[PDB]
Amino acid sequence: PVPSRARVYTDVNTHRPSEYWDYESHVVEWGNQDDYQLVRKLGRGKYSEVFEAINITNNEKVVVKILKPVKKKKIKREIKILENLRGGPNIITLADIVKDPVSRTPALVFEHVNNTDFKQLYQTLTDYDIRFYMYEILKALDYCHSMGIMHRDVKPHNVMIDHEHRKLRLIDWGLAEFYHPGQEYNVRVASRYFKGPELLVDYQMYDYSLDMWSLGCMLASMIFRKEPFFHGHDNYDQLVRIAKVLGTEDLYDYIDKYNIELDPRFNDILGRHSRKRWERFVHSENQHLVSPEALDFLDKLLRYDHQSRLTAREAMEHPYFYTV
Amino acid sequence: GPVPSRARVYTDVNTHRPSEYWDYESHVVEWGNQDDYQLVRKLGRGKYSEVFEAINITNNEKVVVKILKPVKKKKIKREIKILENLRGGPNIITLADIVKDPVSRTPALVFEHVNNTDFKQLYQTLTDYDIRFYMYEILKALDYCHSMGIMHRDVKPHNVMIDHEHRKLRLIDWGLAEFYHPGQEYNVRVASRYFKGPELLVDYQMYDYSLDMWSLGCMLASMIFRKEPFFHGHDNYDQLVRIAKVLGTEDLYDYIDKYNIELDPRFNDILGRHSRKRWERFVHSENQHLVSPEALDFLDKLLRYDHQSRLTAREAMEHPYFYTVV
Ligand SMILES: CCc1ccccc1-c1ccc(CNCCc2nc3c(OC)cccc3[nH]2)cc1Cl
Ligand SMILES: CCc1ccccc1-c1ccc(CNCCc2nc3c(OC)cccc3[nH]2)cc1Cl
């Protein structure tokens, strides 16, 4: 395959000392979990359980994420990334790294986030709300991208919102990675519905632009009230669902531009598909969230070619955000 | 008999944890194959151990290998359980593996690599800031292990490794460490002579984490006054006399009366009568650049006969002497 590099923040890690991006060499100091009392279970991941807790030393609520130790380098990577991004705009704030004296299970302690119900907001959300929160996610992305990191798991489950205080946090940095130009990354990241075409066609030299595809999948689901927007039933079928919207002509132009070899599993399922107009997805239920600006912005995110997608900084200057 | 005593901090941390945590005699040790490590050179010694620099052949990473002279089986079990309990704690030497050479079958412990700076010729370069910085780092290690219900019981310069280039410090040799249980009577034949607390010298067995804070105070006094060691005893009885020549004998009697301690008759002809000295008496041209009112107030609050009156590691961390550190 033809090599590729990010259009923005290409060399941000190249120009930094090894200690910043060398997570395997980073030394983790695990404090005593005795300072925290677990209150209740909040959420759950495939390799984590998230609890609400109280810090007994200051009577402040915190969030404790207990990690299922499956891979050691993976825990070190998330911690390093969290330490590098600690305090960044709309990034979940790592407050402590602790282990329970008896269990010795890795646990991460974060700033408390007061989650407003996802299904309660969904119908009462306005056109303004979507632009407001889209801009807040973009602040988090432009920032982590500038810090040489790609989240690689951008989805609604990984965005916590406290609608009362108009506060948003991008969470679960467990799949996050450091961007290095020319590096070949594992394509088994993100959650099926949010996987970029680069992942589905096994193109490893991807970059920050992967997060912009995932962001486009989120916006499409919100403005059209269609969740998920691209409803694949497996990773191969996922590309077919994308192809039913973007068409198969542009998919072949994409794979030819990067000299990508299409997996034979696609042979009997891909078919032939016309490129659809974004206006076809507008209906009575969703028309109050759709505008020419929203559709133009969406069109500029949901592109096969990872290089042709808007960067987080270009996205922030789009007319869709002129009112925020 | 003697009046009972208990720690002011972390008193019941082991009482409220299951058997599993502190019952080291019941802990099962999994000894891996030492074939993954090649010994490079001898770094140091211990009366019960030899410490080497080694290379892990599987990842080309340097490690530290401590080979234990099997004197007591429960003792190896205790050190391993404590190291596993503290594994990953701040400024604690990190146990990476537990191995046995296939032929020798000798217990060996594998740790994270620590790059020791030659403490020699660099004591003269050390600044007031460096002492405060490194003292704070040791306090992080102590508050953590005490919070985990462990007393180190051998705090001294030899057991603190410093990589000055990276400003990295590790508290090592947990071979004398013990689990703290309130009301437990411990063996007083612990620590190294110059660092032994008065509780050990007067054979007061119901001691606690505060023993480590006395040893820390001996280290601080030696560094700030450039007097190594600060309390230079020639035997364990003479050690108490050396302390008494500084702290005075009036406060020593108040200490032994508070705990109804019986003073050994061996002290009768050597203890004498000693006035309590001002810490300012130890300031000279060679060390005045390391001494300040804050340092002397902090030292005074560590070097107390009464183990209960000494600062805890958490109280020490909040002292004005540390207001200038990160
Ligand atoms: C107007 C915002 C928006 C714009 C476009 C697309 C989607 C949304 C959106 C819609 C809903 C949500 C809310 N997601 C909450 C997910 C969440 N993850 C959690 C969790 O993870 C461990 C634990 C406990 C609670 C948790 N809550 C987030 C977002 Cl970003
Ligand atoms: C005088 C005490 C003091 C007071 C305040 C601040 C610093 C010091 C100090 C000053 C120097 C050192 C250096 N200690 C070296 C310890 C060491 N232990 C080793 C070892 O043990 C087996 C093997 C090989 C090398 C080893 N090096 C440690 C310390 Cl803690």
Side-chain angles (χ1 to χ4, degrees):
Chain A
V2 171
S4 172
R5 61 192 174 115
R7 273 161 84 216
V8 293
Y9 310 129
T10 320
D11 299 313
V12 289
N13 286 334
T14 312
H15 288 115
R16 284 175 185 135
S18 96
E19 300 97 278
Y20 180 78
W21 44 260
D22 197 7
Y23 59 84
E24 287 159 293
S25 301
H26 176 66
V27 168
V28 192
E29 305 192 306
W30 304 88
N32 196 342
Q33 195 181 118
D34 290 355
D35 283 350
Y36 309 90
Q37 267 192 47
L38 298 179
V39 172
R40 57 173 174 128
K41 190 174 182 161
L42 298 170
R44 202 185 198 178
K46 280 187 174 181
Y47 300 124
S48 75
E49 270 176 65
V50 177
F51 293 84
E52 176 176 73
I54 187 99
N55 181 354
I56 74 151
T57 71
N58 62 358
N59 209 3
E60 292 205 322
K61 292 185 266 80
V62 293
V63 162
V64 173
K65 180 195 193 167
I66 292 151
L67 311 157
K68 302 198 179 100
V70 277
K71 296 110 185 171
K72 239 207 193 81
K73 285 168 184 182
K74 212 161 272 201
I75 291 153
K76 282 191 156 205
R77 183 180 72 182
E78 179 165 357
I79 298 172
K80 187 71 204 180
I81 280 167
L82 287 164
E83 288 190 349
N84 290 342
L85 301 178
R86 192 202 262 109
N90 297 337
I91 311 293
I92 194 82
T93 309
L94 183 65
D96 210 345
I97 297 151
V98 294
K99 277 197 285 172
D100 166 74
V102 60
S103 82
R104 290 168 36 195
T105 312
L108 300 179
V109 189
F110 304 93
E111 64 156 298
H112 187 264
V113 181
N114 224 318
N115 277 275
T116 302
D117 178 37
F118 64 96
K119 208 75 183 73
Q120 263 177 258
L121 42 100
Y122 194 65
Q123 201 200 315
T124 206
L125 285 181
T126 72
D127 181 16
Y128 178 79
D129 287 319
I130 307 177
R131 308 170 178 231
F132 178 82
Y133 289 125
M134 282 298 287
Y135 200 78
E136 291 302 299
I137 296 166
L138 284 173
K139 283 188 199 173
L141 295 177
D142 187 43
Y143 173 75
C144 72
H145 293 170
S146 76
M147 293 288 286
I149 300 147
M150 37 183 185
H151 183 281
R152 309 196 305 178
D153 198 22
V154 171
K155 59 177 170 170
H157 184 68
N158 285 344
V159 180
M160 282 178 166
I161 300 174
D162 180 24
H163 193 46
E164 190 195 1
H165 304 279
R166 299 194 75 84
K167 181 173 142 286
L168 179 149
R169 296 294 184 264
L170 175 62
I171 73 156
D172 206 341
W173 295 79
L175 288 179
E177 251 300 6
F178 289 92
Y179 177 72
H180 298 279
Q183 189 163 141
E184 289 184 321
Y185 299 94
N186 194 309
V187 301
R188 298 201 102 178
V189 292
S191 311
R192 194 201 297 148
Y193 311 142
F194 308 91
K195 296 171 179 274
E198 55 269 52
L199 306 186
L200 309 165
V201 301
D202 193 22
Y203 182 73
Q204 297 188 82
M205 207 173 293
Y206 62 80
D207 58 72
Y208 313 114
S209 62
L210 170 63
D211 291 334
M212 303 307 290
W213 172 275
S214 300
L215 187 62
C217 296
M218 291 183 64
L219 178 70
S221 70
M222 195 45 70
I223 64 173
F224 298 129
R225 298 188 87 247
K226 185 185 187 293
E227 43 175 62
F229 187 72
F230 298 123
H231 195 157
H233 290 350
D234 60 65
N235 297 334
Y236 297 91
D237 185 58
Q238 188 64 32
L239 187 61
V240 187
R241 316 313 296 170
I242 294 169
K244 284 173 140 269
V245 185
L246 308 188
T248 48
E249 288 191 10
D250 295 350
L251 172 62
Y252 281 103
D253 279 336
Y254 178 50
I255 63 154
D256 290 342
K257 178 183 168 167
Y258 296 96
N259 192 239
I260 288 155
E261 184 146 309
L262 251 202
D263 196 291
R265 280 282 290 273
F266 288 116
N267 294 171
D268 291 290
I269 59 169
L270 196 46
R272 287 166 215 164
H273 300 284
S274 60
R275 187 234 197 242
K276 310 305 182 294
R277 287 212 278 249
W278 299 105
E279 38 268 60
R280 288 209 94 188
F281 303 97
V282 182
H283 302 107
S284 54
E285 322 242 307
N286 68 36
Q287 60 93 42
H288 71 284
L289 304 173
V290 181
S291 63
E293 315 89 79
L295 297 187
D296 185 77
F297 179 47
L298 184 65
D299 186 61
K300 284 163 161 67
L301 293 180
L302 293 180
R303 297 192 165 183
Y304 287 119
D305 190 351
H306 55 274
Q307 290 184 12
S308 308
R309 297 177 201 146
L310 296 176
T311 66
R313 199 60 242 182
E314 289 163 355
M316 286 172 92
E317 269 127 46
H318 192 277
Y320 176 65
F321 300 106
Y322 287 174
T323 59
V324 311
Chain B
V3 172
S5 173
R6 60 192 173 115
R8 272 158 88 213
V9 294
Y10 311 132
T11 321
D12 297 315
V13 294
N14 290 319
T15 311
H16 289 115
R17 294 182 188 127
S19 200
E20 203 208 288
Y21 187 77
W22 45 258
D23 184 23
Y24 57 84
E25 289 156 291
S26 298
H27 176 69
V28 167
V29 191
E30 307 194 311
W31 304 88
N33 197 343
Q34 191 182 122
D35 292 354
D36 291 341
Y37 310 91
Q38 268 190 46
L39 300 181
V40 173
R41 57 173 173 126
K42 192 171 182 161
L43 299 170
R45 226 176 281 188
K47 285 192 182 179
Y48 309 125
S49 74
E50 270 175 66
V51 177
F52 297 80
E53 176 176 74
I55 188 99
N56 181 354
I57 74 150
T58 71
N59 62 358
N60 209 2
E61 292 204 323
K62 293 184 265 80
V63 294
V64 162
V65 174
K66 179 194 192 166
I67 292 150
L68 310 157
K69 302 196 179 100
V71 149
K72 303 295 168 182
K73 239 208 191 82
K74 287 169 183 183
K75 213 171 140 313
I76 290 152
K77 283 190 151 197
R78 183 181 72 181
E79 183 170 1
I80 293 162
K81 183 70 196 177
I82 286 171
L83 288 170
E84 289 189 349
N85 286 342
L86 300 180
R87 192 201 261 109
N91 296 340
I92 313 297
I93 194 83
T94 309
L95 182 67
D97 209 346
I98 297 151
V99 294
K100 271 186 177 226
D101 166 75
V103 188
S104 82
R105 291 169 217 157
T106 310
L109 299 179
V110 189
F111 304 93
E112 63 156 299
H113 186 263
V114 181
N115 223 317
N116 278 276
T117 303
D118 266 22
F119 38 97
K120 310 220 175 293
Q121 295 200 317
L122 275 90
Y123 289 128
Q124 204 199 315
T125 80
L126 288 180
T127 72
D128 181 15
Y129 179 79
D130 301 327
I131 308 176
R132 297 174 189 236
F133 177 82
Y134 289 127
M135 282 288 298
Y136 200 79
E137 292 302 299
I138 296 167
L139 285 169
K140 284 188 200 171
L142 296 178
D143 186 44
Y144 172 76
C145 72
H146 296 165
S147 82
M148 294 288 284
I150 296 133
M151 302 187 270
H152 182 281
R153 309 196 305 179
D154 198 19
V155 170
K156 57 179 171 169
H158 186 69
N159 289 337
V160 180
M161 282 179 165
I162 301 175
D163 170 8
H164 195 49
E165 189 195 1
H166 304 279
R167 298 194 75 83
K168 182 171 140 288
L169 177 150
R170 295 295 184 263
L171 174 61
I172 73 157
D173 207 338
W174 294 80
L176 287 179
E178 246 307 357
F179 288 89
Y180 177 70
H181 296 280
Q184 186 162 143
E185 287 186 321
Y186 295 98
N187 193 315
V188 302
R189 301 202 117 182
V190 294
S192 302
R193 187 199 306 147
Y194 311 141
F195 306 93
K196 291 167 189 282
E199 55 270 51
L200 305 184
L201 308 166
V202 303
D203 194 21
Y204 183 74
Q205 298 188 80
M206 208 175 292
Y207 63 81
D208 58 74
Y209 314 114
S210 63
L211 169 63
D212 293 333
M213 301 309 288
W214 171 276
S215 299
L216 187 61
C218 294
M219 291 184 62
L220 179 68
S222 70
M223 191 46 70
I224 72 171
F225 298 132
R226 300 182 88 248
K227 185 183 187 296
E228 184 71 54
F230 187 72
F231 298 123
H232 195 159
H234 290 352
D235 61 65
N236 296 334
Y237 296 90
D238 183 59
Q239 188 67 30
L240 187 61
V241 187
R242 311 312 289 179
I243 293 170
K245 285 173 138 266
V246 185
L247 308 188
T249 48
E250 292 182 356
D251 294 353
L252 172 63
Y253 281 104
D254 276 335
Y255 177 47
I256 62 154
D257 291 341
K258 179 183 167 167
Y259 296 96
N260 192 239
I261 288 154
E262 185 148 310
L263 250 202
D264 196 291
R266 281 283 191 273
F267 289 116
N268 293 171
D269 291 290
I270 59 169
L271 195 48
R273 284 171 213 165
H274 299 285
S275 59
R276 186 234 197 243
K277 308 307 181 295
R278 288 221 275 249
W279 296 107
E280 297 83 350
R281 176 198 170 96
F282 303 98
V283 179
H284 301 107
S285 56
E286 327 95 44
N287 66 34
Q288 59 94 42
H289 72 283
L290 305 174
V291 182
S292 62
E294 315 88 81
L296 297 187
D297 185 76
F298 178 47
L299 186 63
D300 186 62
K301 284 164 161 67
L302 292 179
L303 292 181
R304 296 190 166 184
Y305 287 118
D306 189 351
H307 54 276
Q308 291 184 10
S309 308
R310 295 177 201 146
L311 297 177
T312 64
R314 200 59 243 182
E315 290 162 353
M317 285 173 93
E318 268 127 46
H319 192 277
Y321 176 65
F322 300 106
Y323 287 174
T324 60
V325 311
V326 201

